[PDB]
Amino acid sequence: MKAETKSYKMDDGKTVDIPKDPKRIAVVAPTYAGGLKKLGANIVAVNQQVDQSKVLKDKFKGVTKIGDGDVEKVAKEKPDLIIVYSTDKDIKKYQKVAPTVVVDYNKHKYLEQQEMLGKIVGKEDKVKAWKKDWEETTAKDGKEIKKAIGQDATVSLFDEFDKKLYTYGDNWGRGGEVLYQAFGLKMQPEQQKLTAKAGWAEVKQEEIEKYAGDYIVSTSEGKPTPGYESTNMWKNLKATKEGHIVKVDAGTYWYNDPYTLDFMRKDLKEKLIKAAK
């Protein structure tokens, strides 16, 4: 008894010994859940946050749910591999349980992230195939969306985060990966400048007009009207006056794994084409 292990160089430069073929993965960091599920990995524990997604909840039925810090619950599932963010405060505790892969979220753009998960579980060929399909499809989608909204149309992305107005770059979820990378739509220029270093930013809500483009995607679907959509400033944005607001489901759009990506691809394409009428 002794699963054969392979060396893996983590984001921090440290090498760790992980199973060549992991059988029981505890996915504490939920960014990585859908991508590992897509690759057929056996996940024995997953962060309860997946249950906020219209896409991922059904995909993890029967899988033990865990919240942040629950080392005991993770231990009980006897995992052979544990996935956490670099910002996780319980990393040493996880390490005493199973080889723990510590991912620095901002080190991987969304396609490289899925390639990274392919390396972890030894299924890079499956990633390649999926990626080629994704790119070809979203390339045609983006060309169609551009003809509908206009090649130079800018698109802003707004979200309420901890009771504050936030915006995002092209790889911090909220649909940004599909809007700005897969579709190739133009990001509103002040949004791009502000989010350029960090990938995300709080926006002073009285300055929202500064960051508002030809179209606005807001993660407010199914919610009461947020503070930032209720102002006279919001009412007088050209995008608002023109009927160019697209609303999306925040719990679902937070993610950027292959299942979520296919959903946001369809949903945004539909909403963007409608908003352009």
């Binding site: 960014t31 963010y85 910002t87 979220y105 901002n106 960090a198 990938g199």
Partner: peptide, 6 residues
């Protein structure tokens, strides 16, 4: 990331 979860 710093100042938030990731």
């Amino acid at each position: 990331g710093g100042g938030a979860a990731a």
